[PDB]
Design a protein around this ligand. Structure first.
Ligand SMILES: NC(=O)c1ccc[n+]([C@@H]2O[C@H](COP(=O)([O-])OP(=O)(O)OC[C@H]3O[C@@H](n4cnc5c(N)ncnc54)[C@H](O)[C@@H]3O)[C@@H](O)[C@H]2O)c1
Ligand SMILES: Nc1ncnc2c1ncn2[C@@H]1O[C@H](CSCC[C@H](N)C(=O)O)[C@@H](O)[C@H]1O
Ligand SMILES: [Cl-]
Ligand SMILES: [Cl-]
Ligand SMILES: [Cl-]
Ligand SMILES: [Cl-]
Ligand SMILES: [Cl-]
Lengths: 491, 493, 494, 494
């Protein structure tokens, strides 16, 4: 309700110290605070955020607060929260937080629901804006509205919320069961809750590829109920966070969760997109022999041109040492694959959720034995072969689960985009007239802003930009102040 | 009717290199195997302005096997490989007007000759090509400037004054390339003042290979001055993200090793521009121990360089201490005479970008009291009279990879050229939609992602790459077809 | 005495699990256990070890035990011990351990002294020393030699030597904490038994030294005729110096920096002071994650090598104000002074991967007038100067960052180093009869043969699926080597 | 022969221009010229050199000349000579040259013999030999020793030895072309003057050998008591083996491949046979341009090093059918056999960066029954087998690809190697009085000191803007070295 749910408020001092050190490099957020803390462009805005509550995220939240917004926050992953970062926010009254490291899936959805719940002075209401990372906040909202419509239609709790199985007879994921449990609970309390939030919702800014995919599907089906900004596809996000962020954070995660030396090992990177590219650079950097799997012939060729062998998993599963999933897809590592792996092979996911690796199938395999090697590291032994595989973070984000995620510099680039997106959505609220238009679309930030995010971080690294002369600008057909590239330029 | 090349006896070496090159150019080999019977380009007259290398010979061969009649010239005075040209002439694949080390005057005469076709209806009459393969926009330029010249000629009933003067609108000397093109245009106005406009009737399009040429097309498009449909081949993912990057990673080094005697390891090498070309150049240079310093105007590109461990500086701060300078900007005057006077003894300067304007070669060659000596073929050392310091320029400021070496290797050129053939087939198959009886405006388009992915598929076996195939469930999960395309149109790879 | 001093025996199960996972890659130690567990080549040997008590070290200790030795162990660094690794050893009765993470300097020397103290098997009421020593940095070797010196000076004047009671050195400056605490132990032992150290010499047959720094100390003693036992330089085996030092640090430096330094390494100017075997590895790792590495070096050959790998080579004074992170890998003293740290930019990070804590002048920093310090996290402190109000962040109080903020080198390379250690211990033990102390024998430092050096490498090839080519009889004759090696001359540098 | 045998004297101007540009980076040679051109330490010395006559070598020759030596030179490889470099030397009277690009093997040995032949300054109508030899591969050293053996066998039976007339060896197999052509020269010299070779020994004071292969031959002669003159192993200087061999090949292999192989290296599986100093460099370069390097190796230590740098290590048999390009860097024989080449895929490229032409079995390939060969370009031949109709493309007939298809290593690293050469020549010349042949004196192979090795590196620091740090008196004492070095022990591997 009014008060936060965190692990330990006494960790606040450590969180505040890390925030100040992190700000040395997060110049984008620091500049936005300096430029807008007086004018308060977000004054009066109620912002709910679902995003890994790390030290870096604390600076984002602080920035939103300095710009005048009231804030409620939760994490987008059960293992990613840094307790000292959460405590710092609560200690300084920057936001109302519902997050802690090592949440149960049930608590995850309760926290998200709590973060979405705001008290109207003199009754309940929702947020004005949403910062989402993976689409869970956006999902609970849309599924909540659907549940309420189905509830009024038949005057009973929808049967899909009570069943433990899906349309095809398979067990629902824990995440779906726990969300449904929350939705059912809210239908019993107030069946106009979700639709009531739509009146004041002016938008959502989505951080990731996976979340953007869900938004684009809803958009094309006429089911998106609020404006949305795709932050992921800003050049200063997808080409930095996804690539250079993972280059460092994958290693940090592997070094903490995997005791073995990476040098000389055959490490399979499944997927060679923006994340995979970064993972491969990092792994090579410390002597690993990277093997790539890929479905896209263009991405496969890119891997080959960087000197990496490109194979189908079946041909290298028995001899490779470590497997890293970076596909954003489902079942890229099956139970059948894991049974063919060699003794003490390590398996990790840097992609999304926990379905890239079939963790459910592994945990529920008949007669399988499991032991905790350390926090968030489990060794599974098959009964017939007596061979074992070691899974990091129960198949969830290894960089945020076994380590602290991306470092401040690149997160400042991603989060500067987030703040700019929130400001865009808020400044455009007058155009959101639900007595007229209710089905909305997804847009991206302009190239001008994209270049601006980069400008804001040049001094951190002592970068000196060259300035075009009037003649040069005319010659390459651009303004001296940009933008410098066409909209289709790939960097 | 007959070709102008250096030496037909080099044909055998050219044919041997073509066959070895085809081992890796599987895209072109597959197109030949798939379309040599159906002849999708049957009857098409294709004029090409593109570095006549062994790789280009396979492109030309592919177009010929698909049924086209061909006339070709190079797009750069130093890039032609004489054995490649001879091979084409020897086998009657095409009529060639190209040789290594052309004068600028001969360059434009060759281009004009390549654009000139004898009409098959009336053999005593002249006509133009149906399609154009252009690399830098010179073929597209002479066409548009030719039409302008003819309109101005009819208006005043005399040779336009801009074609006779040696100066431009601002009083500065015209570039040699402009003077020599103007000289050709003047000559053609005297022979036939309806030549260029007469070619428009049968022109169905141009497929442009490079960034620089695409820029010229986009300017014409926005001013309503583009006189034919165009396909931007450069911006295909299988071209800009491979040829420009990985091609230059190898070909820049080849060029530097041939033109620059010095060791690259430990040297401070400035790469001006960190776009698709600059990125590749930097990887290659680092790969052999150089300490790469990047200059850039785009803050996003500058940050990318920094994230790969490269120092990013303004030229003024590193010009006196750096050892080698490589221009990869596609811009003008990035290395001025004032910059070269501050450089250290025997600093090397090269351009991998475009034309010869990135470095102010004109200003250097015409500097008062400057001394020049030929170090070797296409390598000149300039000594300033006051400081007595020297700088060494590779290829008179023209493409170092194609001037001092043989350009990109077959594999990546097959990817670029597979796109070219597909573009030519697209333009030819769409002929009926080109209606000039109206005041139609032409635009620039790109090939589809389906074809872009196809180009990549065609080259996977060369390198033993094994693609994974999506299951029906996976395809639904990431919202794509099992056969693609696999990425949104805005995806940057 | 009889029982171990560790933090928590209940952590044993986690330690045993990590040991088994680590053994998947430590094939050298696994092979030695399989080959010698029955014959017990070290049967009856009393071995004292001073070496970072990590999981990897636990497998070394286990190997020595399986080969028949009785063992007492302590760590060679106050922060490097992994408590679960120590517990595993105590739980299985493999050794008597005196080690825990985050020891005080006083406790460090007490633990070392305890590890060196053995109950004589003939008369249980009497004390004796070890037969062999595994040393990492030379502290075990130092306390022995300084102990003997102290005892000789004690008999000469029949009183406690004045250098052991004073808190100052010969020049009037404060003694290092490590010296004060060792002296405190030596004084205590002179009062208990002034023939303790010389009494250990009768049964000491050798020491196998793991590091460059320790080897330097041995070579100095050797040249002055002051080395009191045979010694084996393990560091200079090719399978140690060219792997552990280089590839080990390439991974463990990063692990340490990622845990202690919250910042992104990409695009940062990171100064690596020293470009030896450690520096080379550090630079590869840092570059691998996008850092712009700047090297400082005193050796013109090493400086050129750095330049050939694309690194700028500068003197610290010219880059101290603009660099972001500083890593000392010199094995030298005062490479980063207080004056240097005052010129650094806000929140610059400083770390040491070299030795002890004197590469960076931590004493001068901590004792600077009016300096403020705050704990950022475990083993990470931010120091703020009073005049400029600028701060610097020091990792592990200037001690080994890879072992202090992380878990040190991974198993594979430590197996290579430790396979050399076991082979050295076996060499020293098998040669005991030749150590005749009834004369004024002078001891020297030797290295393991190339045959054994190649053997260590052979033992680890299968781990990584490496397939060796075998020479034909003609090829072997052509390059003038035996089909079974060794394949290189003694001066070959790899 | 008084006059030189070169291709074209008119190329002299281009050679002189390249020499001056090259000297910008060859600071070692430039410094030796500046320091010794007045004192002439080599005054009166007759120096014969057998070493790739490149622009870099021209600066070496110029340096020797400036130091006072009279010079005769030939190349050590039939394809390596740069004609403009040779012309420059002849044009300026720096030396008498017997070299040109694309020599026949017969002409190679005639040129070497001519370079070894000097007109005696006492009696101009009589012959004598050189005082000193600069050798690269050991051919100059070989013809001398085989010449002496031939003369001894000639006097013993008073007839031409039968091994010099036969075209076969002791086992009935064809002698290599290099042996036949050398024997043809030796036979010719026995008929003219059977005391020629032994007569040269009176005035021979030494040979400085540039390469690993040549050093091996010297070490064999040394151990058999058959070395007839003092020798200096230049290869094993740190400033040679750790730079020239590694960083030189990193650039020159690529240059050679780019000129001889039309294909793209990126994404190709390129097998590097041998991972020594040359192989290491080759692998870095190849990776640098996107190749996927696969290493073969016989030394388990070198194999592990490759693995730690991320390279697959395999036996050739397991990858020969699927790899694209093969580079031999072993210094061994028959590492690529005819059976291997028959299993290779269509248009696979094969090259050697090692030595001579026996790493790849070129003889077996060229003489294979029914094989077809075509010249693709200068020094590039495609061989097609008759049964499979598959082809393989061989660069430079299996000889040094970097010097055959390209111009060899660049000036900076050659200055480091050649500064060592000049210092070696000065050492041998200054020691001439100690060569007393009135006894049955046995000669040995020695190396230059670490002091000089460090000096070579110091001389090249300014070229690259390297700033060395200087030790304080306290630091120097702490690490036990002199402020001015040497900084490392003799066994240090860098
Ligand atoms: N091209 C050049 O300019 C150049 C430059 C320097 C050295 N070299 C020559 O290159 C050769 C190698 O020099 P190096 O300094 O690397 O010598 P090295 O002794 O350092 O390396 C040779 C390596 O080859 C391995 N080897 C031997 N036989 C083998 C076989 N049958 N299969 C696989 N591996 C095998 C050895 O184990 C060793 O690791 C020498 O002949 C040397 O003279 C050439
Ligand atoms: N070996 C080769 N053969 C043919 N074209 C090549 C080549 N190597 C590179 N190229 C082409 O050169 C193109 C840009 S260069 C053209 C720039 C400008 N017209 C000039 O000459 O200065 C690239 O898009 C690439 O496709
Ligand atoms: Cl645009
Ligand atoms: Cl067919
Ligand atoms: Cl800088
Ligand atoms: Cl002061
Ligand atoms: Cl002097």
């Amino acid at each position: 309700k009014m008060e936060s749910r965190i692990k330990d408020i006494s960790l606040a001092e450590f969180g505040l110290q890390d925030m100040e050190i992190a700000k040395t490099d997060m110049m984008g957020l620091v500049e936005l605070q300096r430029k807008y803390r007086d004018s308060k462009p977000l004054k009066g805005a109620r912002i709910t955020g679902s995003l890994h509550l790390t030290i870096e995220t604390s600076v984002l939240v602080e920035t939103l607060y300095e710009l005048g917004a009231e804030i409620r926050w939760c994490s987008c992953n059960i293992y990613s929260t840094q307790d000292h970062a959460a405590a710092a926010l609560v200690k300084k009254n920057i936001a109302t937080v519902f997050a802690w490291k090592n949440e149960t899936i049930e608590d995850y959805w309760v926290c998200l629901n709590d973060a979405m719940t705001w008290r109207n002075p003199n009754k309940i209401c929702g947020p004005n804006l949403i910062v989402d990372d993976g689409g869970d906040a956006t999902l609970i909202l849309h599924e909540g509205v659907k549940a309420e419509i189905e509830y009024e239609k038949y005057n009973k709790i929808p049967e899909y919320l009570e069943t433990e199985l899906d349309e095809n007879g398979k067990q629902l994921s824990m995440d779906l069961k726990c969300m449904y449990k929350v939705l059912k609970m809210e239908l019993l309390k107030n069946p106009f809750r979700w639709r009531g939030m739509l009146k004041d919702l002016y938008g959502v800014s989505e951080e990731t590829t996976t979340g953007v995919l869900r938004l684009k599907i809803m958009e094309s089906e006429g089911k998106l109920l609020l404006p949305a900004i795709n932050v992921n596809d800003s050049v200063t996000k997808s080409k930095f966070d996804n690539t250079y962020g993972c280059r460092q954070s994958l290693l940090h995660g592997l070094f903490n969760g995997c005791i073995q030396m990476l040098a000389g090992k055959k490490i399979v990177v499944l997927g060679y997109g923006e994340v995979g590219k970064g993972c491969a650079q990092g792994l090579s950097g410390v002597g690993a022999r990277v093997i790539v799997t890929e479905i896209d012939p263009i991405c496969a060729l890119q891997a080959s041109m960087e000197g990496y062998q490109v194979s189908v998993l079946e041909d290298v599963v028995s001899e490779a040492d470590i497997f890293i999933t970076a596909t954003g897809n489902k079942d890229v590592i099956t139970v059948e694959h894991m049974r063919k792996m060699k003794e003490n092979a390590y398996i990790a996911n840097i992609g999304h959720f926990d379905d890239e690796i079939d963790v459910y199938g592994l945990e529920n395999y008949p007669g399988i034995k499991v032991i905790e090697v350390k926090q968030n590291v489990h060794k599974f032994t098959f009964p017939d072969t007596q061979k074992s595989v070691i899974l990091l973070c129960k198949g969830r984000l290894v960089n945020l689960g076994c380590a602290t995620g991306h470092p401040p510099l690149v997160m400042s680039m991603s989060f500067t985009n987030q703040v700019l997106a929130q400001m865009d959505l808020w400044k455009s609220r007058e155009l959101v007239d639900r007595s007229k238009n209710t089905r909305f679309f997804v847009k991206k930030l302009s190239k001008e802003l994209d270049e601006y995010v980069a400008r804001l971080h040049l001094d951190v690294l002592g970068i000196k930009l060259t300035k075009l002369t009037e003649t040069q600008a005319k010659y390459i057909n651009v303004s001296i102040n940009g933008p410098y590239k066409s909209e289709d330029y790939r960097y």
